Specification:
alpha+beta, Phosphorylase Kinase, domain 1, Transferase(Phosphotransferase), domain 1, 2 domains, five-stranded antiparallel beta sheet, about 40% helix, about 15% strand, transferase, protein kinase, Alternative splicing, ATP-binding, Chromosomal rearrangement
Length: about 325
């Protein structure tokens, strides 16, 4: 037959013959993801499997949009879709989608673990921004960026895996958390958290439930200003003012020098520049937050700036199932 079946944990991966020697590498919201060798292209790939996405309105939209978007966006810092296929032969039996992306070497989350120097770090954030820029120019604002969905290669290149919204909430910008409208730089917020996390190694803004999310933010950055507050909904604004007030710490408090290299004037100045960048991304009020182009130009990041890289309705389950299937036959 054209396909065969390998058992991967609770999953049975039923795949085209071209894809050899499957090994599990990780697991997100859509399910398990395997690395695989691809005899046709003689190179390694990733196979994400989507089980029955049509049977939930959200997964259904994430899946449709992402097929569509995947062949519709082409940027070196956005993961590329190599192939899609289902092993089922009619709509009626259709059930699983298999997506073949390109493959890297690690998760952003692991790379946050290493004691990074400014070279490696500025260059990763440069790429993140280039990629977000490319998604923005496209008409896509991600709103749900997080490190586990970003992957890297030994040579330190970097791909975003997904397209956000249009569990872990630690990186959602405040405008999102509070549902209050947003512009492009809602994505800058998350770059903030990931940048802090690279420095602090702890998650910036942990917090158990959503209410406790907020409270770790203001604890550190301080309560937002009133012209912010006036923008919430009548009811919604009341809920939030009902906390203790905070001044929030300065950014050399939040990110002391012990955390950066300090032997050299070079290292002292770079640290300074990082803190400034952070100081401008991690700004609760978007109206005052740095935006994407200005961040690429920022001294911490621009030793990398390359204009070549920088520039470039609802349904029923049934209807979703068809739309998704139809899209898999291309
Ligand atoms: C931890 O996994 C990762 O970070 C990862 C994920 C990933 C998986 C699930 C959830 C989030 C992201 C990924 C997803 C898509 Br779609 C496309 C590419 C990647 C990727 O390149 N890596 C790096 C990677 C590439 C290869 C390996 N290692 C192996 O392939 C092991 C092979 C073996 O053991 O023989 C590990 C990570």
């Amino acid at each position: 037959n054209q396909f065969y079946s390998v058992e991967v944990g609770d999953s049975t991966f039923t795949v085209l013959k071209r894809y050899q020697n499957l090994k599990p590498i990780g697991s997100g919201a859509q399910g398990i993801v395997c690395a695989a060798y691809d005899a046709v292209l003689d190179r390694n790939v990733a196979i994400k499997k989507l089980s029955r996405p049509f049977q939930n309105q959200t997964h259904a939209k994430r899946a449709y949009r992402e097929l569509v978007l995947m062949k519709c966006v082409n940027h070196k810092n956005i993961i590329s879709l190599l192939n899609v296929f289902t092993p089922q032969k009619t709509l009626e039996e259709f059930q699983d989608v298999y997506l073949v992306m390109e493959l890297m070497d690690a998760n952003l989350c692991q790379v946050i673990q290493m004691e990074l120097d400014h070279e490696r770090m500025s260059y990763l954030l440069y790429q993140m921004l280039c990629g977000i820029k490319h998604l923005h120019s496209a008409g896509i604002i991600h709103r749900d960026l997080k490190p586990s969905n970003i992957v890297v290669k030994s040579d330190c290149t970097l791909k975003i895996l997904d397209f956000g919204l249009a569990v872990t909430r630690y990186y959602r910008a405040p405008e999102v958390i509070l549902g209050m409208g947003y512009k492009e730089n809602v994505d800058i917020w998350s770059v903030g958290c990931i940048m802090g996390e690279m420095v602090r190694h702890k998650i910036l803004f942990p917090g158990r439930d959503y209410i406790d999310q907020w409270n770790k933010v203001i604890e550190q950055l301080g309560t937002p200003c009133p012209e912010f507050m006036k923008k919430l909904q009548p009811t919604v604004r009341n809920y939030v003012e009902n906390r203790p007030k905070y001044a929030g710490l300065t950014f050399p408090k939040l990110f002391p020098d012990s955390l950066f290299p300090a032997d050299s004037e070079h290292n002292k100045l770079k640290a300074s520049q990082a803190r400034d960048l952070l100081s401008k991304m991690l700004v609760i009020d978007p109206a005052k937050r740095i935006s994407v182009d200005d961040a690429l130009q920022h001294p911490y990041i621009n030793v990398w700036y390359d204009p070549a890289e920088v520039e470039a309705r609802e349904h029923t389950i049934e209807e979703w199932k068809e739309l998704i299937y139809k899209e898999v036959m291309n």
